[PDB]
Design a protein around this motif. Structure first.
Motif, PDB file in Angstrom:
ATOM      1  N   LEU A   1      28.798  47.467  35.279  1.00 19.96           N
ATOM      2  CA  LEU A   1      30.079  46.779  35.333  1.00 19.96           C
ATOM      3  C   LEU A   1      30.724  46.911  36.705  1.00 19.96           C
ATOM      4  O   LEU A   1      31.256  45.938  37.249  1.00 19.96           O
ATOM      5  CB  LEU A   1      31.002  47.330  34.261  1.00 19.96           C
TER       6      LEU A   1
ATOM      7  N   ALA B   1      28.864  44.843  39.084  1.00 22.03           N
ATOM      8  CA  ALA B   1      29.269  43.469  38.868  1.00 22.03           C
ATOM      9  C   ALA B   1      30.593  43.190  39.545  1.00 22.03           C
ATOM     10  O   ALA B   1      30.793  42.113  40.098  1.00 22.03           O
ATOM     11  CB  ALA B   1      29.365  43.188  37.377  1.00 22.03           C
TER      12      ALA B   1
ATOM     13  N   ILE C   1      31.117  40.414  42.300  1.00 19.51           N
ATOM     14  CA  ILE C   1      32.096  39.345  42.174  1.00 19.51           C
ATOM     15  C   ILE C   1      32.935  39.258  43.434  1.00 19.51           C
ATOM     16  O   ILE C   1      33.184  38.172  43.966  1.00 19.51           O
ATOM     17  CB  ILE C   1      32.992  39.579  40.946  1.00 19.51           C
ATOM     18  N   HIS C   2      33.393  40.406  43.919  1.00 19.03           N
ATOM     19  CA  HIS C   2      34.489  40.453  44.871  1.00 19.03           C
ATOM     20  C   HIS C   2      34.064  40.634  46.319  1.00 19.03           C
ATOM     21  O   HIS C   2      34.863  40.357  47.215  1.00 19.03           O
ATOM     22  CB  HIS C   2      35.441  41.577  44.481  1.00 19.03           C
TER      23      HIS C   2
ATOM     24  N   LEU D   1      39.799  40.901  48.402  1.00 18.41           N
ATOM     25  CA  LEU D   1      40.427  41.536  47.253  1.00 18.41           C
ATOM     26  C   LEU D   1      41.895  41.151  47.156  1.00 18.41           C
ATOM     27  O   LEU D   1      42.355  40.671  46.115  1.00 18.41           O
ATOM     28  CB  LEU D   1      40.306  43.055  47.354  1.00 18.41           C
TER      29      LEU D   1
ATOM     30  N   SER E   1      38.148  29.255  40.139  1.00 22.47           N
ATOM     31  CA  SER E   1      38.469  30.003  38.936  1.00 22.47           C
ATOM     32  C   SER E   1      39.208  31.291  39.240  1.00 22.47           C
ATOM     33  O   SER E   1      39.756  31.904  38.321  1.00 22.47           O
ATOM     34  CB  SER E   1      37.199  30.300  38.149  1.00 22.47           C
TER      35      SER E   1
ATOM     36  N   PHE F   1      39.305  35.436  31.039  1.00 31.47           N
ATOM     37  CA  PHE F   1      38.577  36.488  30.350  1.00 31.47           C
ATOM     38  C   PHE F   1      39.276  36.865  29.055  1.00 31.47           C
ATOM     39  O   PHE F   1      38.656  36.922  27.988  1.00 31.47           O
ATOM     40  CB  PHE F   1      38.456  37.702  31.258  1.00 31.47           C
TER      41      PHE F   1
ATOM     42  N   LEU G   1      51.517  55.462  36.070  1.00 33.41           N
ATOM     43  CA  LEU G   1      50.366  54.628  35.756  1.00 33.41           C
ATOM     44  C   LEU G   1      50.790  53.176  35.608  1.00 33.41           C
ATOM     45  O   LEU G   1      50.122  52.266  36.113  1.00 33.41           O
ATOM     46  CB  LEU G   1      49.698  55.140  34.485  1.00 33.41           C
TER      47      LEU G   1
ATOM     48  N   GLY H   1      51.616  51.649  39.130  1.00 31.06           N
ATOM     49  CA  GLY H   1      50.417  51.202  39.813  1.00 31.06           C
ATOM     50  C   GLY H   1      49.820  49.967  39.174  1.00 31.06           C
ATOM     51  O   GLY H   1      49.372  49.051  39.868  1.00 31.06           O
ATOM     52  N   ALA H   2      49.830  49.908  37.846  1.00 31.11           N
ATOM     53  CA  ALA H   2      49.251  48.759  37.168  1.00 31.11           C
ATOM     54  C   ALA H   2      50.040  47.490  37.458  1.00 31.11           C
ATOM     55  O   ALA H   2      49.457  46.431  37.730  1.00 31.11           O
ATOM     56  CB  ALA H   2      49.188  49.027  35.670  1.00 31.11           C
TER      57      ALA H   2
HETATM   58  C1  CLA Z   1      34.805  47.411  37.362  1.00 34.96           C
HETATM   59  C2  CLA Z   1      34.723  46.156  37.784  1.00 34.96           C
HETATM   60  C3  CLA Z   1      35.778  45.423  38.422  1.00 34.96           C
HETATM   61  C4  CLA Z   1      36.844  45.826  39.181  1.00 34.96           C
HETATM   62  C5  CLA Z   1      37.244  47.163  39.582  1.00 34.96           C
HETATM   63  C6  CLA Z   1      37.624  44.610  39.523  1.00 34.96           C
HETATM   64  C7  CLA Z   1      38.812  44.621  40.260  1.00 34.96           C
HETATM   65  C8  CLA Z   1      39.615  43.519  40.469  1.00 34.96           C
HETATM   66  N1  CLA Z   1      39.392  42.240  40.063  1.00 34.96           N
HETATM   67 MG1  CLA Z   1      37.612  41.606  39.188  1.00 34.96          MG
HETATM   68  N2  CLA Z   1      36.157  41.006  37.832  1.00 34.96           N
HETATM   69  C9  CLA Z   1      35.186  41.815  37.339  1.00 34.96           C
HETATM   70  C10 CLA Z   1      35.050  43.199  37.567  1.00 34.96           C
HETATM   71  C11 CLA Z   1      35.884  43.959  38.296  1.00 34.96           C
HETATM   72  N3  CLA Z   1      37.024  43.519  38.993  1.00 34.96           N
HETATM   73  C12 CLA Z   1      34.297  41.079  36.479  1.00 34.96           C
HETATM   74  C13 CLA Z   1      33.166  41.674  35.798  1.00 34.96           C
HETATM   75  C14 CLA Z   1      34.804  39.795  36.408  1.00 34.96           C
HETATM   76  C15 CLA Z   1      34.267  38.673  35.655  1.00 34.96           C
HETATM   77  C16 CLA Z   1      35.006  38.523  34.367  1.00 34.96           C
HETATM   78  C17 CLA Z   1      35.961  39.749  37.276  1.00 34.96           C
HETATM   79  C18 CLA Z   1      36.739  38.617  37.518  1.00 34.96           C
HETATM   80  C19 CLA Z   1      37.898  38.623  38.240  1.00 34.96           C
HETATM   81  C20 CLA Z   1      38.783  37.489  38.537  1.00 34.96           C
HETATM   82  C21 CLA Z   1      38.513  36.136  38.090  1.00 34.96           C
HETATM   83  C22 CLA Z   1      39.831  38.002  39.269  1.00 34.96           C
HETATM   84  C23 CLA Z   1      39.555  39.440  39.404  1.00 34.96           C
HETATM   85  C24 CLA Z   1      40.567  40.122  40.124  1.00 34.96           C
HETATM   86  C25 CLA Z   1      40.500  41.453  40.375  1.00 34.96           C
HETATM   87  C26 CLA Z   1      41.597  42.263  41.040  1.00 34.96           C
HETATM   88  C27 CLA Z   1      42.818  42.294  40.143  1.00 34.96           C
HETATM   89  C28 CLA Z   1      42.746  43.361  39.096  1.00 34.96           C
HETATM   90  C29 CLA Z   1      43.587  42.928  37.948  1.00 34.96           C
HETATM   91  O1  CLA Z   1      44.420  42.026  37.900  1.00 34.96           O
HETATM   92  O2  CLA Z   1      43.366  43.674  36.832  1.00 34.96           O
HETATM   93  C30 CLA Z   1      44.477  44.495  36.449  1.00 34.96           C
HETATM   94  C31 CLA Z   1      44.120  45.902  36.731  1.00 34.96           C
HETATM   95  C32 CLA Z   1      45.030  46.877  36.644  1.00 34.96           C
HETATM   96  C33 CLA Z   1      46.419  46.584  36.251  1.00 34.96           C
HETATM   97  C34 CLA Z   1      44.689  48.296  36.921  1.00 34.96           C
HETATM   98  C35 CLA Z   1      45.357  48.870  38.145  1.00 34.96           C
HETATM   99  C36 CLA Z   1      45.216  50.371  38.118  1.00 34.96           C
HETATM  100  C37 CLA Z   1      45.967  51.095  39.220  1.00 34.96           C
HETATM  101  C38 CLA Z   1      45.094  51.115  40.449  1.00 34.96           C
HETATM  102  C39 CLA Z   1      46.373  52.478  38.715  1.00 34.96           C
HETATM  103  C40 CLA Z   1      46.573  53.584  39.738  1.00 34.96           C
HETATM  104  C41 CLA Z   1      48.009  54.026  39.914  1.00 34.96           C
HETATM  105  C42 CLA Z   1      48.093  55.531  40.084  1.00 34.96           C
HETATM  106  C43 CLA Z   1      48.055  56.163  38.717  1.00 34.96           C
HETATM  107  C44 CLA Z   1      49.356  56.029  40.761  1.00 34.96           C
HETATM  108  C45 CLA Z   1      49.497  55.641  42.217  1.00 34.96           C
HETATM  109  C46 CLA Z   1      48.936  56.674  43.165  1.00 34.96           C
HETATM  110  C47 CLA Z   1      49.758  56.872  44.425  1.00 34.96           C
HETATM  111  C48 CLA Z   1      50.018  55.570  45.134  1.00 34.96           C
HETATM  112  C49 CLA Z   1      51.056  57.575  44.128  1.00 34.96           C
HETATM  113  C50 CLA Z   1      40.904  43.624  41.275  1.00 34.96           C
HETATM  114  C51 CLA Z   1      40.598  43.827  42.724  1.00 34.96           C
HETATM  115  C52 CLA Z   1      41.586  39.090  40.509  1.00 34.96           C
HETATM  116  C53 CLA Z   1      41.774  39.073  41.995  1.00 34.96           C
HETATM  117  O3  CLA Z   1      42.600  39.692  42.673  1.00 34.96           O
HETATM  118  O4  CLA Z   1      40.891  38.257  42.620  1.00 34.96           O
HETATM  119  C54 CLA Z   1      40.434  38.657  43.908  1.00 34.96           C
HETATM  120  C55 CLA Z   1      41.072  37.729  39.960  1.00 34.96           C
HETATM  121  O5  CLA Z   1      41.661  36.669  40.117  1.00 34.96           O
HETATM  122  N4  CLA Z   1      38.418  39.796  38.826  1.00 34.96           N
END
Ligand code: CLA
Ligand code: CLA
Ligand code: CLA
Ligand code: CLA
Ligand code: CLA
Ligand code: CLA
Ligand code: CLA
Ligand code: CLA
Ligand code: XAT
Ligand code: BCR
Ligand code: LMU
Lengths: 86, 312, 41, 220, 227, 213
Positions: free
Chosen positions: B201, B204, B208-209, B234, B246, B254, D186, D189-190
């Motif tokens: 995953l 993947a 994707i990215h 990103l 998309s 999704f 959390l 960040g989300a």
């Molecule tokens: C593990 C695999 C993985 C990962 C890590 C990502 C990651 C990402 N994807 Mg991708 N994606 C994946 C698989 C993955 N993808 C797959 C398999 C598909 C096909 C279905 C896609 C299809 C897809 C599309 C179509 C898009 C993305 C997008 C994104 C981005 C937005 C994330 C989002 O909105 O979710 C929400 C996620 C969260 C809310 C979690 C955030 C958690 C944070 C980091 C918590 C940490 C905070 C911490 C506790 C405290 C702060 C610390 C300090 C500062 C104090 C992100 C970079 C979007 C994007 O930006 O495009 C470039 C977008 O449009 N993805």
């Protein structure tokens, strides 16, 4: 809107279907596993996990049946999308 | 609860005392050598852990930490290949012309005439033409810079030191018991969900990215210097929604199960890319998404601590 | 570190060190005196 | 046990004596038997308290600039989102500090190295840090029996919680607010990753349109 | 030590009211060893008395001549009429010698209490010492001592703590707003809702340097913001 | 009970409070054996004395090169000395090797046999080369003011001060090298650049020290 569409209806139906199947003794749960011949027998439960539900439905039960029902609904909606029914 | 963490604190003291005494692991060789056959037996029985002792717990701990050492060595080797592709390679020259320039990542020092081994590979470079295929793997990852190889090498060295620290820890500081190793249900559930499911995953996600847009632009003739950096693909969703519309829809397709909208970067093309001669990275991305789902549902099969699942 | 230095005194480590030193000496000789076929100097 | 999710295995060693023990240990990490390393109960409780205090510092520090610029007490230059403050220069960086963030980061390195290593050396050797000279400050660094609650003249400055029952009450309140703040961080960040806006902006936009500005509409 | 600094607290073991103005505060535990307590009490007295003189000088100079900014009054172009544009080096030398003497004598009073009580030129007249930090004698010529010594000591040290707070307030108000203390009070009474610490923090009227007869003094603030 | 480099951590067994500058800093247990520890004591002392001389010389020549006197910097003074004066560098180098070899061989064979070097073998000098302790020779020659003699507590204090300023000077010379490697200018050049703008002019704003940014 999405809430009220065919996809949402099918998904909630499948999820609540598996949940009401596990709650009312029609599907294998944490407290009731199955044998080779699919007869519901009890389990060791390997930790013991408490629940206020009268039947003993747990958070693990709802997680498992939510995952199963979400798989079921995903597959069903993408199948109906695949055969052109959706 | 049955399946749980179960370890012993500080089982084996950390000292070179047994380094100075070769043959310590056995009862026969610890007495010392009298014939040269001892010198060979010292090495033949070195990792024969199930004859040094009878208890499976100590054998298992030895095996676990030895695996950690092997992983650390593999990380050293991987970091070394990335580092040689960063310092001693024609990779940035090969990316511009991969059909003409020979992949080389090993330079020979000019000492006794072996500078003749520094062949004219291409890209204004002189070295040994490698055949391990790291250049193709890196292009498929979307590297496009020697600095990324350098930092991947440093990360590999960090992870190697981590693996060796882990072996030392899980042998000398906190070594697990036999009933921890014997939870094969948990080991399979985890190695299928998290190791091969979440690993595919995550790969993947990278595909994707980072791989798909970078390689899509590389195949469109764009110079690797003017390609957007992966973090820019990103953050700036505009670039991705220009490359794949998309991405303008976000991750909603999704969660709404309108997955066909994703048919721009999750394909079933089949065959080969006519411009590179390799598999479509959209095909591989969809592949890894699919097998990640498959392995994550396969990792929820065996029974560990909550009665659901199977007993093997 | 008496035991550590005892370990470095073992046969394979001493052989590694000594042959590393010998090979480096021969290598630097062959760098600073390239292609020594005869004893002319 | 309370806190649905509790297990019969956890209630064997979860006897309510720890601050915030609501029986919720479904993974059973606080098992004293056959525990070593960092999954011992002491280190896990300690790290709960530390993550808690740091997280309830951060949950106020991520929301404070936004709600104080919206209130008008700070100007709009420093009224910035918490991820656009220099912690993640890709996301953004305030440039109006007294130095570049790496100068200040090395100051942070030194300061927190001192602080957290003294903290660690009091966890490891609990009687310590009251013995070796630290410019006379070692009088407040003797700590207590436990590690998460030193309670010297400074760390318990107002000597609040004189009795044992009020002390346990305050520990419960501290750990509850801390867990709440961990979840809030959390969520910060989300919501930063998804919405891209600040937490107060998300709050006012949810209170402006609850059914059209929420998690589900932010997926697109 | 009665009526501590806070209701729900306890006094430290080393503060029992033996010294003046002891509310048993010491949250940083700095007065744990008694020699450090002696040193810190002496430095307290010094900071206190010099800060009382400081606020007195600022307030008196501001009332009798408001046209001179006390923050820039140290400059030779702002010195009074006999000393205007004087050579600051010889002035610093005068101060250096005349204060090195008296402060080394005070330090020797600290190190050997009752050894520098004697006039080292005219060998007949000594200064007594009830305690350390309170010489008296020629330093107490009006004879307010030989009375309620602890009470006057508490008054001195309390007004001194207050003067420390107040002089750092003067300095901060001068750096933030650019005006004197009573100037700042009149300006706050001119606009008590738009002219306060709000919208003044973040501005430092202090320049990044000055040129006092050729030198370049760094001239910092106590906090950043607007040079 | 004694100051330790890493407080709370107890000192190792071989580092008792007998040597000067003993803070229990041997995380690698390099001086575990007493003879090796004596060798390393003398090594620390020679390094620190050479580094004290080196740091003082660098500081002084940089002072003279900063105020505008005709001084080369420490990274250029050797060329300037052998080129301004008609000095042959191999000749000077082997002269230095001869002299330092005599001195250091004497010191060596007083480490291996402490009573030696005082038999009158050298030129009749007996008590000038007898040696007081390991790393502290003393005598009429290496101690003409006799500060190791007279007061013993003052001598222990001076030992502490010596080894502490020596470690500080070693760190300072390593810093000189690193700063020439980074900023390419002299040490007091760097100091004045820091004193001008302490912020924005430091190791974080080189470009080489922190390569991230
Ligand atoms: C593990 C695999 C993985 C990962 C890590 C990502 C990651 C990402 N994807 Mg991708 N994606 C994946 C698989 C993955 N993808 C797959 C398999 C598909 C096909 C279905 C896609 C299809 C897809 C599309 C179509 C898009 C993305 C997008 C994104 C981005 C937005 C994330 C989002 O909105 O979710 C929400 C996620 C969260 C809310 C979690 C955030 C958690 C944070 C980091 C918590 C940490 C905070 C911490 C506790 C405290 C702060 C610390 C300090 C500062 C104090 C992100 C970079 C979007 C994007 O930006 O495009 C470039 C977008 O449009 N993805
Ligand atoms: C066994 C047969 C054999 C023989 C006789 C030789 C002979 C030689 N080979 Mg060949 N070679 C062989 C096998 C052999 N080789 C094999 C099997 C390989 C494949 C690995 C090679 C591969 C090979 C290459 C690739 C090269 C040679 C070279 C050489 C020359 C080396 C001369 C040299 O190093 O000067 C060394 C001269 C000395 C005086 C050193 C002698 C040793 C000691 C140090 C002397 C003692 C002095 C002093 C007291 C030491 C101080 C003590 C110290 C502890 C401080 C010489 C003609 C080189 C060459 O140019 O050939 C013409 C060269 O480039 N050989
Ligand atoms: C309303 C019920 C419903 C309907 C109409 C469909 C309809 C469909 N499903 Mg779905 N499905 C459903 C429920 C449903 N499904 C449920 C409940 C699940 C969960 C178990 C799934 C899980 C599922 C998966 C995982 C897949 C489908 C696929 C398909 C499609 C083609 C299958 C085929 O021809 O393979 C015929 C295949 C063979 C004859 C040989 C297979 C050889 C294998 C590889 C050997 C091992 C078809 C559109 C497939 C799809 O989407 O492809 C486009 C697919 O991969 N279904
Ligand atoms: C599988 C691991 C592996 C392997 C087989 C090699 C193999 C090699 N490396 Mg690489 N290297 C590795 C990992 C590896 N490296 C890693 C992990 C790093 C990061 C620290 C480096 C950093 C590195 C540098 C910086 C250089 C090499 C060089 C070399 C060559 C000569 C090394 C030598 O003579 O050392 C001598 C070893 C002893 C005397 C002992 C050789 C081809 C050299 C090279 O190819 O120059 C052209 C060179 O300059 N390596
Ligand atoms: C084969 C791999 C492996 C396995 C099976 C174990 C197994 C174990 N370790 Mg060991 N360990 C490993 C590797 C491994 N470790 C490595 C590589 C290190 C060096 C960092 C350590 C360092 C280590 C310490 C210091 C300790 C353990 C402990 C433990 C025990 C409990 C772990 C647990 O519940 O934490 C579950 C995991 C967490 C609570 C948080 C993990 C967070 C990390 C940073 C993420 C892991 C990587 C992630 C999966 C991939 C990255 C994804 C990310 C980018 C999003 C268990 C016996 C503990 C113990 O009881 O002593 C025996 C303990 O104190 N381990
Ligand atoms: C808050 C004002 C204040 C008060 C109440 C005191 C009170 C005292 N001082 Mg302190 N003193 C002060 C300010 C003050 N001083 C300042 C600003 C300086 C620096 C010049 C000193 C320097 C000083 C020295 C050097 C000595 C004293 C001494 C004394 C004691 C006897 C004199 C006396 O009572 O005068 C009371 C004064 C007033 C009520 C008038 C205050 C207002 C005027 C404008 C008594 C404890 C002597 C002592 O304790 O010896 C036994 C002694 O040796 N003081
Ligand atoms: C946690 C407390 C805190 C912190 C760290 C800062 C930090 C900062 N403030 Mg803010 N400020 C705060 C509370 C805080 N402020 C409050 C409570 C008020 C009222 C102000 C009013 C304020 C003003 C009016 C200004 C600042 C400015 C600044 C900057 C220079 C000072 C700096 C980024 C200045 C700036 O750069 O903008 C500025 O003009 N602050
Ligand atoms: C061991 C430490 C050390 C070393 C290696 C050097 C080395 C050097 N110094 Mg420095 N110096 C040092 C300590 C050191 N100094 C100390 C402690 C002080 C004080 C100085 C003060 C100093 C000055 C003031 C000068 C040097 C100069 C020199 C250079 C030539 C010295 C010469 O002509 O021989 C002198 C030989 C004898 C006196 C015969 C015996 C050379 C680069 C000179 C130069 O041109 O370099 C900038 C110079 O002007 N040094
Ligand atoms: C930094 C240094 C040593 C650092 C050692 C450290 C941290 C050791 C640490 C540990 O081992 C311990 C303690 C205990 C172990 O368990 C752990 C570790 C961690 C392993 C030595 C510098 C040693 C530095 C020395 C000796 C410097 C001498 C400088 C001289 C002579 C300079 C001369 C000149 O500069 C002038 C004066 C003028 C120029 O023109 C000419 C020249 C010649 C350039
Ligand atoms: C309180 C209560 C109640 C109610 C309750 C409820 C309402 C519940 C619900 C519940 C639910 C509602 C749940 C859900 C769940 C879900 C889930 C758990 C999900 C999951 C998911 C998943 C797991 C996924 C997976 C996947 C993916 C991701 C992709 C594709 C593939 C697959 C599908 C595999 C009652 C009756 C009233 C009364 C009493 C009590
Ligand atoms: C371990 C966690 C795994 C779960 C996946 C989350 C990993 C987070 C990786 C770092 C992502 C940083 O980038 C993320 O923030 C950007 C700025 O808010 C977002 O940017 C996006 O949303 C913002 C407002 O809608 C705007 O900037 C743009 O319209 C759009 O590009 C993207 O949603 C995402 O690219």
């Amino acid at each position: 809107g999405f809430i009220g569409s065919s996809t949402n209806l099918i998904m909630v139906a499948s999820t609540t279907a598996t949940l009401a199947a596990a709650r009312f003794g029609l599907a294998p749960t944490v407290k009731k596993n199955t044998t080779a011949g699919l007869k519901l027998v009890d389990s060791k439960n390997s930790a013991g996990v408490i629940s206020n539900d009268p039947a003993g439905f747990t958070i693990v039960d709802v997680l498992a049946m939510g995952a199963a029902g979400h798989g079921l609904g995903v597959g069903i909606v993408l199948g109906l999308k695949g055969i052109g029914a959706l | 609860k049955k399946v749980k963490i179960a370890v012993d604190r500080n089982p084996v003291e950390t000292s070179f005392e047994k380094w100075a005494k070769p043959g310590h692991f056995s009862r026969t060789l610890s007495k010392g050598p009298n014939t040269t056959t001892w010198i060979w037996n010292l090495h033949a029985d070195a990792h024969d852990f199930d004859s040094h002792t009878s208890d499976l717990e100590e054998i298992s701990r030895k095996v676990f930490s030895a695996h950690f050492g092997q992983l650390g060595i593999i990380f050293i080797w991987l970091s070394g290949m990335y580092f040689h592709g960063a310092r001693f390679s024609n990779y940035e020259a090969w990316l511009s012309d991969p059909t003409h320039i020979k992949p080389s990542a090993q330079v020979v020092w000019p000492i006794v005439g072996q500078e003749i081994l520094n062949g004219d590979v291409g890209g204004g470079f002189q070295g040994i033409q490698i055949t391990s295929g790291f250049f193709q793997l890196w292009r498929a990852s979307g590297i496009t810079s020697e600095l990324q190889l350098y930092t991947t090498a440093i990360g590999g060295l960090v992870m190697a030191a981590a693996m060796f620290f882990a072996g030392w820890f899980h042998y000398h500081k906190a070594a697990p018991k036999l009933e921890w190793f014997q939870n094969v249900e948990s080991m399979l559930n985890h190695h299928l969900g998290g190791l091969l499911g979440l690993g595919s995953l995550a790969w993947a996600g990278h595909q994707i990215h980072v791989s798909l847009p970078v390689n899509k632009l590389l195949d469109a003739g764009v110079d690797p210097k003017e390609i957007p950096l992966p973090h820019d693909l990103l953050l700036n969703r505009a670039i991705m929604a220009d490359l794949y519309p998309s991405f303008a829809k976000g991750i909603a397709p999704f969660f709404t199960l309108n997955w066909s909208e994703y048919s721009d970067f999750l394909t079933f093309k089949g065959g080969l890319n006519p411009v590179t001669g390799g598999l479509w990275l959209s095909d591989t991305a969809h592949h890894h998404v699919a097998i990640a789902v498959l392995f994550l549902v396969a990792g929820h099969m065996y029974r560990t601590n909550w009665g659901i699942g199977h007993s093997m | 570190m008496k035991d550590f230095t005892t370990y470095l005194s073992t046969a394979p480590v001493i052989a590694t060190i000594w042959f590393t030193f010998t090979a480096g000496l021969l290598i630097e000789i062959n760098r600073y005196f390239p292609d020594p076929l005869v004893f002319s100097f | 046990q309370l806190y649905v999710g509790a297990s019969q295995s956890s209630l064997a060693y979860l006897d309510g004596s720890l601050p915030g023990d609501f029986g919720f240990d479904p993974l059973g990490l606080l098992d004293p038997v056959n525990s070593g390393g960092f999954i011992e109960p002491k280190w896990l409780q300690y790290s709960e308290v530390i993550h808690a205090r740091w997280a309830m510092l951060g949950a106020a520090g991520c929301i404070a600039p936004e709600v104080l610029g919206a209130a008008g007490l700070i100007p709009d230059a420093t009224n910035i989102k918490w991820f656009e403050s220099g912690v993640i220069p890709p996301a953004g960086s305030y440039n109006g500090y007294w130095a570049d963030p790496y100068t200040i980061f090395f100051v942070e390195i030194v300061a927190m190295q001192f602080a957290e290593l003294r903290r660690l050396q009091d966890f490891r050797y609990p009687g310590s840090m009251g013995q070796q000279y630290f410019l006379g400050l070692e009088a407040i660094f003797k700590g207590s029996g436990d590690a998460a609650y030193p309670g010297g003249p400074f760390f318990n400055l107002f000597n609040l919680g004189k009795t044992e029952a009020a002390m346990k009450e305050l520990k419960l309140k501290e750990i509850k607010n801390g867990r709440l703040a961990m979840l809030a961080m959390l969520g910060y960040g989300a919501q930063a990753v998804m919405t891209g806006k600040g937490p107060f902006q998300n709050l006012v936009e949810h209170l402006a349109d609850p059914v059209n500005n929420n998690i589900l509409t932010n997926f697109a | 030590d009665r009526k501590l600094w806070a209701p729900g607290v306890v006094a430290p073991e080393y503060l029992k009211g033996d010294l003046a103005g002891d509310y048993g505060w010491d949250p940083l535990g700095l007065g744990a060893d008694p020699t450090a307590l002696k040193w810190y009490r002496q430095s307290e007295l010094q900071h206190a008395r010099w800060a009382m003189l400081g606020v007195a000088g600022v307030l008196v100079q501001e009332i009798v001549k408001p046209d001179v900014y006390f923050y820039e009054a140290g400059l030779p172009q702002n010195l009074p009429e006999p000393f205007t544009n004087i050579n600051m080096g010889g002035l610093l030398a005068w101060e250096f010698i005349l204060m090195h003497w008296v402060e080394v004598r005070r330090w020797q009073d600290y190190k050997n209490f009752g050894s520098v009580n004697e006039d080292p030129i005219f060998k007949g007249n000594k200064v007594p010492n009830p305690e350390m930090g309170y010489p008296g004698g020629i330093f107490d010529p009006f004879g307010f001592s030989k009375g309620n010594l602890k009470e006057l000591q508490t008054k001195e040290i309390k007004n001194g703590r207050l003067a420390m707070i107040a002089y750092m307030a003067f300095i901060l108000q001068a750096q933030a707003t650019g005006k004197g203390p009573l100037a700042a009070l009149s300006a706050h009474l001119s606009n008590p809702f738009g002219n306060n610490i709000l919208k003044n923090i973040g501005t430092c009227t202090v320049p990044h340097s000055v040129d006092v007869q050729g030198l370049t003094i760094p001239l910092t603030c106590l906090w950043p913001g607007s040079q | 009970v004694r100051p330790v480099w890493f407080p709370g951590n107890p000192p190792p067994a071989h580092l008792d409070g007998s040597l000067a500058g003993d803070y229990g800093f041997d995380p690698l247990f390099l001086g575990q054996e007493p003879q090796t520890l004596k060798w390393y004591v003398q090594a620390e002392l020679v390094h620190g004395r050479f580094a004290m001389l080196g740091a003082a010389g660098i500081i002084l020549t940089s002072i003279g090169a900063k105020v505008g006197l005709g001084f080369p910097e420490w990274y250029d003074a050797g060329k300037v000395v052998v080129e301004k004066n008609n000095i042959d560098f191999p000749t000077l180098m082997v002269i230095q090797f001869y002299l330092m070899g005599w001195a250091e061989t004497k010191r060596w064979y007083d480490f291996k046999n402490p009573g030696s070097q005082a038999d009158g073998s050298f030129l009749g000098f007996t008590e000038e080369f007898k040696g007081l302790e390991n790393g502290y020779p003393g005598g009429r020659f290496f101690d003409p003011m006799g500060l190791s003699r007279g007061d013993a507590a003052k001598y222990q204090e001076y030992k502490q001060k010596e080894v502490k300023n020596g470690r500080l000077a070693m760190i300072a010379c390593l810093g000189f090298a690193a700063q020439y490697a980074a900023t390419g200018k002299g040490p007091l050049d760097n100091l004045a650049d820091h004193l001008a703008d302490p912020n924005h002019v430091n190791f974080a704003t080189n470009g080489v020290s922190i390569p991230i940014a």
